[PDB]
Amino acid sequence: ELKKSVLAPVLDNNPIALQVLGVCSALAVTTKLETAFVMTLAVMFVTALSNFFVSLIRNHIPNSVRIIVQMAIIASLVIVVDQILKAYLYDISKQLSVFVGLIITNCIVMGRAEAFAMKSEPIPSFIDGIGNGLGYGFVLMTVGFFRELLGSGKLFGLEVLPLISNGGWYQPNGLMLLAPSAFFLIGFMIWAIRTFKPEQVEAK
Amino acid sequence: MITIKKGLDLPIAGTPSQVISDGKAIKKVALLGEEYVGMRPTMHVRVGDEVKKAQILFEDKKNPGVKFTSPVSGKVVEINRGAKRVLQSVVIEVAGDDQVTFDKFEANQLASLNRDAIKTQLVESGLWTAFRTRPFSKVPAIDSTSEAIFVTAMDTNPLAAEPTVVINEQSEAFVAGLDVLSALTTGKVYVCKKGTSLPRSQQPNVEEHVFDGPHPAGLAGTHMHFLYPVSADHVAWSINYQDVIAVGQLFLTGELYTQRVVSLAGPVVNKPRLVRTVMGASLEQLVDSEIMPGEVRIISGSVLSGTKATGPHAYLGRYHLQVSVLREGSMVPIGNYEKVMPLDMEPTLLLRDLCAGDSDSAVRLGALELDEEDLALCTFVCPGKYEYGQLLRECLDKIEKEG
Amino acid sequence: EHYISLLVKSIFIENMALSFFLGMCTFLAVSKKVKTSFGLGIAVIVVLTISVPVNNLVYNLVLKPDALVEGVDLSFLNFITFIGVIAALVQILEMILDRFFPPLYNALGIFLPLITVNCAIFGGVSFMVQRDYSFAESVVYGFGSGVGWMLAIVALAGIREKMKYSDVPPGLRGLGITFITAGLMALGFMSFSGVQL
Amino acid sequence: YTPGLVTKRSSHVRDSVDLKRIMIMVWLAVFPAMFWGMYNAGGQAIAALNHLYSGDQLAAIVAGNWHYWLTEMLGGTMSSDAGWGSKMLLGATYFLPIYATVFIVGGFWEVLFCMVRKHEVNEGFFVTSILFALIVPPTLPLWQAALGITFGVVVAKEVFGGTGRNFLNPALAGRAFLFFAYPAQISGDLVWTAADGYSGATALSQWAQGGAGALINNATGQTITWMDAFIGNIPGSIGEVSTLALMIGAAFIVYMGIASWRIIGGVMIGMILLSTLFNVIGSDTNAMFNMPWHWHLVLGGFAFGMFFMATDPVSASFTNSGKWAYGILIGVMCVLIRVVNPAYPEGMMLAILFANLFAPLFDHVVVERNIKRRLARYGK
Amino acid sequence: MSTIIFGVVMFTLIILALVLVILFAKSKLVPTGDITISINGDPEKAIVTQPGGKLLTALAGAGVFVSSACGGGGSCGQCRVKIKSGGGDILPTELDHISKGEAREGERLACQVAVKADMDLELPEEIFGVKKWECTVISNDNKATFIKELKLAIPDGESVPFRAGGYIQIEAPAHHVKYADFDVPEKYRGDWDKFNLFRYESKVDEPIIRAYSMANYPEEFGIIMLNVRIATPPPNNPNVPPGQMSSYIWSLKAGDKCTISGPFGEFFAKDTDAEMVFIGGGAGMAPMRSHIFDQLKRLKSKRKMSYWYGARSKREMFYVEDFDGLAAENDNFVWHCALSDPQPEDNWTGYTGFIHNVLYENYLKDHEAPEDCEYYMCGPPMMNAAVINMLKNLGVEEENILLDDFG
Amino acid sequence: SIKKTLFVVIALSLVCSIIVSAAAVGLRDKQKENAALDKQSKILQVAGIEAKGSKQIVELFNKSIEPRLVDFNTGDFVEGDAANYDQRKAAKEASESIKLTAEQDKAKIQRRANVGVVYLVKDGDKTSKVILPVHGNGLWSMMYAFVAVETDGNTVSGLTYYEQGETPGLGGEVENPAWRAQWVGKKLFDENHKPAIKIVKGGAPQGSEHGVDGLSGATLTSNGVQNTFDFWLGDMGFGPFLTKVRDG
Ligand SMILES: Cc1cc2nc3c(=O)[nH]c(=O)nc-3n(C[C@H](O)[C@H](O)[C@H](O)COP(=O)(O)OP(=O)(O)OC[C@H]3O[C@@H](n4cnc5c(N)ncnc54)[C@H](O)[C@@H]3O)c2cc1C
Ligand SMILES: CCCCCCCCCCCCO[C@@H]1O[C@H](CO)[C@@H](O[C@H]2O[C@H](CO)[C@@H](O)[C@H](O)[C@H]2O)[C@H](O)[C@H]1O
Ligand SMILES: CCCCCCCCCCCCO[C@@H]1O[C@H](CO)[C@@H](O[C@H]2O[C@H](CO)[C@@H](O)[C@H](O)[C@H]2O)[C@H](O)[C@H]1O
Ligand SMILES: CCCCCCCCCCCCO[C@@H]1O[C@H](CO)[C@@H](O[C@H]2O[C@H](CO)[C@@H](O)[C@H](O)[C@H]2O)[C@H](O)[C@H]1O
Ligand SMILES: Cc1cc2nc3c(=O)[nH]c(=O)nc-3n(C[C@H](O)[C@H](O)[C@H](O)CO)c2cc1C
Ligand code: FES
Ligand code: FES
Ligand code: NA
């Protein structure tokens, strides 16, 4: 066995750069590295568990009602993780906030559930969830770095660039806080990824 | 009757006198291979061969049965070839009076002639090449037919000769030619003219249509768009009035008629007028003793659409009825293109398709109705200085090839 | 009346794609060709106009607290119930494409199934429960959100078709420039930011 | 050694016009607005300064601002008796550095992309640089101008392949970047007059607060009449104020055929219709409802955008029918943002940007309808 | 557990209602039973197959066999079929190998096409008439250093029906074959001992199907001559597996048996009076030989015929005696050959170099009408790509050149 | 086959629903306790009283917070079990609540309780500050906040959102300490006794009396906060009570 499957979806098949999945969550939580980091962990854990369970029942999934089966696994796990967290570790439970809904609709969770879980054994399927969530977090956190540093002078809430509001020479950039900045930053990440990995460039 | 408002008449100095005179004697003539669209020649002559008036010089590999015959009797003095051995011209030195004759018929029988009989005489004599299909502006296939044959009895090109003056001298031949076209067409014959009067055909098949307005009004493509819109499955044939006179002469006298009246005009033409010459006449000899001193450009055809008559191409083109002489001197649409396009098209989008090479989209927008000359004005007014005539042929060649 | 205002909120002011940034994964994927983009937009309207009002009745009749019985609130069965309902329509939709599937089934491929799991569709149900919309308002809202989503996707497809004449660097070609194009589109949709209701 | 007819059939005559000549025409068309803008920029600043300070206090202010004592050094006077030479000179000290910064920073990106990608430099940047510099507040920091042009040139134009290959207006895209990234410097009461320590709302902000009667020049205490807004003797972006100057330049480029009169007509139609509709409906609370069309014309940047930016040929629709729709949407959107969007006093930049997104769709509806006529052979 | 029970049943009710609608929709929208596909409109050729699988799989099971080289990858495009109805529009990958004009006719790739509903097919006689036979090896002697002549004999006694330039698909199962098993003459063995190609051992993991052109003119009956080139790893990639099908053929000797799976091919001459020009290379000597033999006795053609074979050394040359007889017996046909690298002992005094430039510098350069000649080519891609470029530079239309590159 | 599909969907549906239903109902009780303890923790945090651990919060909250009931229609103290008053449940019943009109419902709240609990912070035997619960509809969920108003009845001492379901990063920034800390020192009313706290999109001018920066990229959630304060500080909310607080 090897780490190739884990690291494949980081830079070779990034779920947001090469594939088009999970973009909606990228634009909302990439305003902070803290929220982004928690979102990556949540997507990694859920994707891996859900992918694992679908593999167990892959041979038995009917294509007619596959989506229902796939969503039920994902929704049940997300609801339980939320309920378990609310009862114990309630402080963190508030942290999961609306991320219960935001992980169910993350296209990575269902996308890998059909492309991979349906055509792979559960053990390797789990590795797929960890790997895909990692690449999702590579993009999420890279965008989070620029948006938080340039838009707030802060990384993980720690002030790197002094703010004028605190007698600091740096004036924050307001566009980095809104959705469009993420669109532009992600596009430029794709540019860097596809200019260093020309294999992924789209044909003409 | 049909009035055109969107267009442009270039007011270039040196318009012809519109009086037919005799041009300088021509002792050299050629047929230009590259003019015929998609024509790959099968040569029937060699340098030094003696040829008759209507003797076959070469054949089209991709248009079997089409014979390109000599314009004059004489000797083959060269066969110019370019990159990849593309036939540029087959030059024949005029000499003698020999000709190949054909069947002759009475004027009252031409309208009643069998269609296959007309095609054979036209193909054997080489006059079949006068026809061009609109959807590709190629010589029609021998076995093909068209329900609509368009006669261009008008000339709105700058410095162009007046068709009425030429047609007036050959009224009987012109009427005889229309009768033949009446039998040749499956449908109707469209005589597209200006308001001026012309000899008329007694056949109900031959309908006269008047077009008035600026330059684009006189193009067969314009006439087809208004009378018989063309597509892949609706093919029209185009022929100009002087070829119609040639058709009438062939079926009345049984001989290939090769004389032509062309306007020699331009800013550097001392006495711009109409001159009698021959098909494929050498333009270097034709303009001799008629141009002002200096570095000038001889153009076969109009300045808008025409071939630079230099080197192997310094001969009158097959579809050209004028010689213009001039002195040698990114798709940002500001609304110039629409002003010169009277057709029901979105010209800026169409030209963008040609620039981008979107052949399928250009087909949807009406590229199939177009010849290069229909895009000459758009090329003229282009701030980016694109040459859309070339882009259109590239798109049309792509459609023919993939299609 | 009030309804026209609701329809205006869910099309322009609350454009799910360019204003709320919902459904970007399918929106940034099938955006190349107007005909395919229009087909997906039509299907999204079909899914949205059916998903929201049906979930509204189920929520108000079953999941609503103290609705089926007094003292029992099946609120915790909200996400699972809704996504399952959304998934069902998608499952029916896949077959329905088989009648009009050549034009979109081949192009959509993996994303036809992914319509379920679209931030746009789940979110619309959430707003129908986070807010209180009658059945008539749920239908007007659901149809309006879909139409606004279609306007954005069809618009992005128009822009991309226009880019046939563009000269995009390789590496940005396809997804990279599309993200930049969508970011630019969102910039111009921020004209409604102050608009309220 | 003998090219084929292809290369030889090129139209033997061409129109005198070229893209280079088109850009200079647009570049010259804004000179009247630009020159008045500098004159207006100095006049507004000098009046506010005398209204806020006098005596040695004014001298200290003049000494602590390089814009002021540089005008004194070159022969101008900061006193209220200053003539047009000193006012234009003072305004130049603000415009020229902005225009120079925008030209240099934006030009660097233009050449860099052409150099790396083996493209030849394009002259379209002349219009982008001048227009961007003439639509920013006079007090805009230079470092923000550099970023604004960088976003507009790179993100909006270059990454799409350069001039003629983008879909969004580059100059307005740059302004939007500064508008949303640094709103404090391009929105409010401290940026539209160059009198340090002066607070003044521009006309549109004032009408939205109270009414047309609230239209006052705080520095002079005199009411702002429609004539004032029309000529451009009002606070604002250097270049937008004078509707008269813009019309003079707009007339030339429209006459030359560089700017589309269908787009301009559409903008007016949309503005007049919607503003008149708001007038009839009325609103006892929203003062913007009662602004007539003729006031909308001479306020804000409506004139500059309609004449010099909505007419950006590349970002507009490519069909004559679409051009009307494109312009009407701009005019409707501008009034809507002006009237019913509290956040924004003017909405032209956002309005044009909104219309840029939908111009390609309008063309598609039109072009697909032509194909339906064509597939029917136009009923012939 | 009062609320737990109620939620569980209410959840199931919601799910049952949703699935029931889907199941109801499936019944009224998805076809049931088996899929019936009509082949050429003939009821006998109509195939009834259950839903699922690609078209290339269902057709092979029936009595009609469709030629395929890449298989279930949609790459070669030799499996194009005419779908009168069903199947929708052409997939984007298919367009890469099918032009739009062809799409109008209805051409589609069976492998790339997934069978899910009733479809209509019009397969031709050649594809329908495929017969599987297992010939007996007579000779497998080496013609050259890396070329072997195979004399496969049909056991049914009846000769093979095929056109000149055709080919037969050879199918073999998984099998491990060592190059040492090959028997080579001393002449070619010496060249082989320098690099020791006998060291290679091939292990075909799965059954394979390949194509091999014919080297017997039709009048030759009972024998399928074929010329086979041994497959060895690429000159630039030694770290590659050795030949699998060619190696298997080489391992065979007298008495061995192999399958031909019927004939196929689309390489043929034109029934006209135009001058013919042949350009052979390597294994290409099989189809070229059939053309020359076909045009000398099968047709007794008086048209001018020329042959230009590219060889590297005299050792590489084979079939020389047959070519000499045809040229001597009939003057209308003339053959020539040039050595790209003559051996020191060859002492060749004729043409030297590549036929790319040799043919031009000798015949086509002074030819008055090179375009008015039919050209047929078969050889290494370098020779073919270079030759066609030279022919194109002479104004030879593609319709006047037929290419049958074997790789 | 129909038989297999019904079996799997039913079986999968049952196991997953049982797990979800058991987790939600069973852990609900622990969740209910944890959430209640949080509100006492929030009231103390906004009050400026540091407490840590359930017993310290419960003990310090009971001693230091003086819940009282107030009638909004009159803004005067009333008698009831303030310590055990659930304003949320009351607002749902017409007996102890009213329905707001479209014009009146600035906070977008469907209903408003007739009587609402307030909390008095007492350093000694007197009120050093009053904490007022305000709620208004957000984009995704209702947002409930505590506002600590000084005895002046005008100055705001502290703000905290004790219930929110907005998206973290965008709308969940009502919990961000920097944003909450920005409220300290702001004034709820103008000279004319009209609501003046305004959420400024793009950032309020520094030092603003009534200017709090809005949540970046979260206009809808910021609108809810404005809508929350625009109603509860108004006539039908705590407006009358704050005038009375202001005079005594
Ligand atoms: C119409 C037609 C006629 C033909 N006629 C002939 C003919 O007369 N004679 C003839 O010899 N061939 C002919 N061929 C070619 C034939 O199809 C085979 O390519 C050939 O027989 C060699 O078979 P192979 O599978 O061993 O080659 P391959 O193994 O497919 O060739 C690949 C090359 O790399 C090596 N290799 C082997 N396995 C691998 C692997 N897994 N990955 C990478 N490299 C690998 C091989 O040694 C070889 O050098 C014809 C083909 C067609 C279409
Ligand atoms: C792709 C998305 C868009 C890409 C562009 C976004 C880039 C964002 C990072 C921009 C950072 C600029 O950072 C900025 O540097 C300038 C340079 O003096 C500083 O400028 C500071 O000093 C200058 C010196 O004259 C003063 O005039 C100015 O008033 C003051 O702010 C700013 O205080 C600082 O905030
Ligand atoms: C073809 C080229 C034409 C060139 C320009 C065309 C402009 C034509 C005029 C468009 C209509 C003007 O529209 C009319 O304008 C006047 C101001 O002048 C408005 O006059 C006023 O009336 C309303 C009363 O309701 C007031 O609230 C408000 O002060 C203003 O609107 C009228 O309400 C409006 O009905
Ligand atoms: C904010 C306001 C501005 C935006 C709103 C106004 C524009 C509305 C655009 C709607 C989308 C474009 O709609 C476009 O319409 C044309 C006809 O006009 C359709 O027409 C075309 O598609 C249909 C599909 O069935 C086919 O028959 C055929 O190819 C053609 O008719 C296009 O397929 C569709 O893409
Ligand atoms: C009439 C006209 C108007 C133009 N307006 C603008 C403009 O508003 N902004 C701009 O950046 N460039 C403008 N340009 C320059 C150029 O056309 C424009 O930037 C295109 O969007 C791409 O180069 C204009 C050019 C012309 C001819
Ligand atoms: S549609 Fe929202 S994550 Fe894909
Ligand atoms: S088997 Fe090769 S494309 Fe079908
Ligand atoms: Na406004």
UniProtKB/TrEMBL annotation, chain A:
<keyword id="KW-0830">Ubiquinone</keyword>
<keyword id="KW-1278">Translocase</keyword>
<comment type="similarity">
    <text>Belongs to the NqrDE/RnfAE family.</text>
</comment>
<comment type="subunit">
    <text>Composed of six subunits; NqrA, NqrB, NqrC, NqrD, NqrE and NqrF.</text>
</comment>
<dbReference type="GO" id="GO:0006814">
    <property type="term" value="P:sodium ion transport"/>
</dbReference>
<keyword id="KW-0812">Transmembrane</keyword>
<protein>
    <recommendedName>
        <fullName>Na(+)-translocating NADH-quinone reductase subunit D</fullName>
        <ecNumber>7.2.1.1</ecNumber>
    </recommendedName>
</protein>
<keyword id="KW-0739">Sodium transport</keyword>
<feature type="transmembrane region" description="Helical">
    <location>
        <begin position="68"/>
        <end position="90"/>
    </location>
</feature>
<dbReference type="Pfam" id="PF02508">
    <property type="entry name" value="Rnf-Nqr"/>
</dbReference>
<feature type="transmembrane region" description="Helical">
    <location>
        <begin position="125"/>
        <end position="146"/>
    </location>
</feature>
<keyword id="KW-0520">NAD</keyword>
Automatic annotation (TrEMBL), chain B:
<dbReference type="InterPro" id="IPR056148">
    <property type="entry name" value="NQRA_2nd"/>
</dbReference>
<protein>
    <recommendedName>
        <fullName>Na(+)-translocating NADH-quinone reductase subunit A</fullName>
        <ecNumber>7.2.1.1</ecNumber>
    </recommendedName>
</protein>
<feature type="domain" description="Na(+)-translocating NADH-quinone reductase subunit A C-terminal">
    <location>
        <begin position="261"/>
        <end position="310"/>
    </location>
</feature>
<keyword id="KW-0915">Sodium</keyword>
<keyword id="KW-0520">NAD</keyword>
<keyword id="KW-0560">Oxidoreductase</keyword>
<feature type="domain" description="NqrA N-terminal barrel-sandwich hybrid">
    <location>
        <begin position="2"/>
        <end position="94"/>
    </location>
</feature>
<keyword id="KW-1278">Translocase</keyword>
<dbReference type="InterPro" id="IPR022615">
    <property type="entry name" value="NqrA_C_domain"/>
</dbReference>
<feature type="domain" description="NqrA second alpha/beta">
    <location>
        <begin position="114"/>
        <end position="256"/>
    </location>
</feature>
<keyword id="KW-0813">Transport</keyword>
<dbReference type="Pfam" id="PF05896">
    <property type="entry name" value="NQRA_N"/>
</dbReference>
UniProtKB/TrEMBL annotation, chain C:
<dbReference type="GO" id="GO:0016655">
    <property type="term" value="F:oxidoreductase activity, acting on NAD(P)H, quinone or similar compound as acceptor"/>
</dbReference>
<keyword id="KW-0830">Ubiquinone</keyword>
<dbReference type="GO" id="GO:0022904">
    <property type="term" value="P:respiratory electron transport chain"/>
</dbReference>
<keyword id="KW-0812">Transmembrane</keyword>
<dbReference type="InterPro" id="IPR050133">
    <property type="entry name" value="NqrDE/RnfAE_oxidrdctase"/>
</dbReference>
<feature type="transmembrane region" description="Helical">
    <location>
        <begin position="37"/>
        <end position="54"/>
    </location>
</feature>
<protein>
    <recommendedName>
        <fullName>Na(+)-translocating NADH-quinone reductase subunit E</fullName>
        <ecNumber>7.2.1.1</ecNumber>
    </recommendedName>
</protein>
<dbReference type="GO" id="GO:0006814">
    <property type="term" value="P:sodium ion transport"/>
</dbReference>
<comment type="function">
    <text>NQR complex catalyzes the reduction of ubiquinone-1 to ubiquinol by two successive reactions, coupled with the transport of Na(+) ions from the cytoplasm to the periplasm. NqrA to NqrE are probably involved in the second step, the conversion of ubisemiquinone to ubiquinol.</text>
</comment>
<keyword id="KW-0813">Transport</keyword>
<keyword id="KW-1133">Transmembrane helix</keyword>
<keyword id="KW-0520">NAD</keyword>
From TrEMBL, chain D:
<keyword id="KW-1003">Cell membrane</keyword>
<feature type="transmembrane region" description="Helical">
    <location>
        <begin position="347"/>
        <end position="367"/>
    </location>
</feature>
<comment type="subunit">
    <text>Composed of six subunits; NqrA, NqrB, NqrC, NqrD, NqrE and NqrF.</text>
</comment>
<feature type="transmembrane region" description="Helical">
    <location>
        <begin position="293"/>
        <end position="311"/>
    </location>
</feature>
<keyword id="KW-0739">Sodium transport</keyword>
<keyword id="KW-1133">Transmembrane helix</keyword>
<keyword id="KW-1278">Translocase</keyword>
<keyword id="KW-0997">Cell inner membrane</keyword>
<feature type="transmembrane region" description="Helical">
    <location>
        <begin position="323"/>
        <end position="341"/>
    </location>
</feature>
<dbReference type="GO" id="GO:0016655">
    <property type="term" value="F:oxidoreductase activity, acting on NAD(P)H, quinone or similar compound as acceptor"/>
</dbReference>
<keyword id="KW-0915">Sodium</keyword>
<keyword id="KW-0830">Ubiquinone</keyword>
